[PDB]
UniProtKB/Swiss-Prot annotation, chain B:
BP term (GO), one: erythrocyte development
Residues the record marks as carrying a glycan: K1, K3, K16, K41, K157, K195
GO cellular component, one term: cytosol
Subunit and interaction comment: Homodimer.
Modification Phosphothreonine, positions: T120
PANTHER family: PHOSPHOGLYCERATE MUTASE (PTHR11931)
Binding site for substrate: 8-15, 21-22, 60, 87-90, 98, 114-115, 187-188
Matches recorded under Gene3D superfamilies: Phosphoglycerate mutase-like
Descriptive protein name: Bisphosphoglycerate mutase
Organ and tissue specificity: Expressed in red blood cells. Expressed in non-erythroid cells of the placenta; present in the syncytiotrophoblast layer of the placental villi at the feto-maternal interface (at protein level).
Source species, domain of life: Eukaryota
Marked site (Transition state stabilizer) residue numbers: H186
Catalysed transformations (reactions): (2R)-3-phospho-glyceroyl phosphate = (2R)-2,3-bisphosphoglycerate + H(+); (2R)-2-phosphoglycerate = (2R)-3-phosphoglycerate
Length: 253, 253
């Protein structure tokens, strides 16, 4: 392909382990996630990647992942840019809830729909939600390209792509066309959103795409920035498929 | 009136070994990392809310900045790194033991090499043990100045000449815009900026030594000139002692 870029989902976190929808809650990576980030950097180093620019969300877990990757590459000097438009999909009222418990109470299929549907919008989070305050009172959301009151309170995967695409078009895509090697440290669903766009995945097929944590995703693009072949997870396919199954199994029981 | 924070990163392995590090990209050791976290805690106590962070391209200043932002929960704050904030280039003296130099050339000469404004260290030659790793690094192949035009040694005067343009053009404008800035730099690059901002004479700058891992508070007026001398944040006795420690590295037992 004419261009190559790397995107990935950050490493494991406390909630990623307790199996609770984290979303816009600024939870940190745990020891296991930090190591995943380090292994990503080692895999990228083994493949000679030399980044010119890194894009992250404003959730610290995606930022720390990038930092750990850069340290392993000895590329801490590479410019980093962060944007809420790369933030994980907003789970609204579901934030904080245990996936397996919801599966038990509502049915595996119901939870699977909420998690992977392109169109279903979660119930908006309310000021009465246990984590509303610790989200909308943070200064990082007072300096976004849109007023605090204009930020979403819940999003379907479709909503995510709608607020992420502008950033890709205006800030990231231009750099890729310039020949720069870009690294995107994002999240599970915000990453699924960008892949849908780049690979032209249908609304139906995007439902079956689940991304493993801490695994480099190589995308090869043509002159029009359209993927030339499905995304490629860099690493041992067997261990990567088990990690994907692990994510899927979070909604089973 | 405007206030900003600048500091020198924490200790590295060559600190206890008493060897000029300069442009060698040495990482912080355990102690240096802790020094950064302590700076972060102090800044958090003062409720600092940074808007921008400027660092050099030496990873120790970058890691220091990252640790401070983590302590503050401000990892999303924009960071910019430039070689123009790099520590003074010690030329051929890089890697040499400061006390050994004092025994070989005398304390007076060592003092001139370390703190004088106009004395230039002998240039580093291709045969020098640390030449390769420095000029072979990609971070210097993408600077605003060709790799072949980068200094091979610098007097404090040389440092100010390549650092001042960066301050005036990229940092000072943010200060005038009321932004809260953090400058994570080095011993002599910080001394060079202080000399300018405080209008310290070529002679008096020789007596200014900065301790590692200590927040430096500086207030500037409408003309971006120091309202008063810089101040060190923390236990003054421990600070003066740390300053003496640095001074004593250039003296005979």
């Amino acid at each position: 392909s004419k261009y190559k870029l790397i995107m990935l989902r950050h490493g494991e976190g406390a909630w990623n382990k307790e199996n609770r929808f984290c979303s816009w809650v600024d939870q940190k990576l745990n020891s296991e996630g930090m190591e995943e980030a380090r292994n990503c950097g080692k895999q990228l180093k083994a493949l000679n990647f030399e980044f010119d620019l890194v894009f992250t969300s404003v959730l610290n877990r995606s930022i720390h992942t990038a930092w750990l990757i850069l340290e392993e590459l000895g590329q801490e000097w590479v410019p980093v840019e962060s944007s809420w438009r790369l933030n994980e999909r907003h789970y609204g009222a579901l934030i904080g809830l245990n996936r397996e418990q919801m599966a038990l109470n509502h049915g595996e299929e119901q939870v699977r729909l909420w998690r992977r549907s392109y169109n279903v919008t979660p119930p908006p989070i309310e000021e009465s939600h246990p984590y509303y305050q610790e989200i909308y009172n943070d200064r990082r959301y007072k300096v976004c390209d849109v007023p605090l009151d204009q930020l979403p309170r819940s999003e379907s995967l479709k909503d995510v792509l709608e607020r992420l695409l502008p950033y890709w078009n205006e800030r990231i895509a231009p750099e890729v066309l310039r020949g720069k090697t870009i690294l995107i440290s994002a999240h599970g669903n915000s990453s699924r959103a960008l892949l849908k766009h780049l690979e032209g995945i249908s609304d139906e097929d995007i439902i079956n795409i689940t991304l493993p944590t801490g695994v480099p995703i190589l995308l090869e693009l043509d002159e029009n920035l359209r993927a030339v072949g499905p995304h490629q997870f860099l690493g041992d396919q067997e261990a990567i498929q088990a990690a994907i199954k692990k994510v899927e199994d979070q909604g089973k029981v």
